[PDB]
Design a protein around this ligand. Structure first.
Ligand SMILES: CC(C)CN(C[C@@H](O)[C@H](Cc1ccccc1)NC(=O)O[C@H]1CO[C@H]2OCC[C@H]21)S(=O)(=O)c1ccc(N)cc1
Ligand SMILES: [Cl-]
Ligand SMILES: [Cl-]
Ligand SMILES: [Cl-]
Ligand SMILES: [Cl-]
Ligand SMILES: [Cl-]
Lengths: 99, 99
């Protein structure tokens, strides 16, 4: 697809057996999802945005289907106001910014 | 250009005749830059992101060049952790997300 930016670039994702809406976000280094359970080990991390930092749990080697495209990588879980697909997974589906 | 996302999509911007670096950010509705002087009157705005909110100065109809493309539009100025180019200006430079 070609996604224009007149509106927020929201897509459906599937993660840990759940369907979620998420933002395709070139400004996010890594993917961050609202509180949910995921399998396996995790470790804590802080990430920063507008407003400051939040504490998240870092889960590695998690598979997400993004707009029907499967990717695997690190997923951060924590109190984000919006689900965000970051560059670590956008690369994997071949996403580019074009102008 | 076609910009891949293996690295942060940083570009040079020109604003008030000065060059700065900024992040192309599809997850941002609005363009937000670090403290700087801009001409004219400003209006209040609060923006909300991952770690809570910040107050910013909203300047309208500001001439800005992004990666060599001319734009004229709203720039928010305040204590953002990084300079971000949001959809308001990404649309002016004809940017799309493609995968
Ligand atoms: C500020 C960026 C450098 C980083 N952020 C991504 C950014 O796209 C967020 C993503 C975002 C979006 C909504 C709410 C929180 C986070 N947008 C954002 O804060 O935009 C603000 C400016 O325009 C307004 O429109 C959206 C909120 C305002 S972030 O969400 O803080 C973040 C930081 C690190 C990671 N790994 C993942 C996400
Ligand atoms: Cl992958
Ligand atoms: Cl990863
Ligand atoms: Cl590539
Ligand atoms: Cl990419
Ligand atoms: Cl604008």
């Amino acid at each position: 697809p070609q996604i224009t930016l007149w509106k927020r670039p929201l897509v459906t994702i599937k993660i840990g057996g759940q369907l979620k809406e998420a933002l395709l976000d070139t400004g996010a280094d890594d993917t961050v999802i609202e509180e949910m359970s995921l399998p396996g080990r995790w470790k804590p991390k802080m990430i920063v945005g507008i407003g400051g930092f939040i504490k998240v749990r870092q889960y590695d080697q998690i598979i997400i289907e993004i707009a029907g495209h499967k990717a695997i990588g690190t997923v951060l879980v924590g109190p984000t106001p919006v689900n965000i697909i970051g560059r670590n997974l956008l690369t994997q589906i071949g996403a580019t910014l074009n102008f």
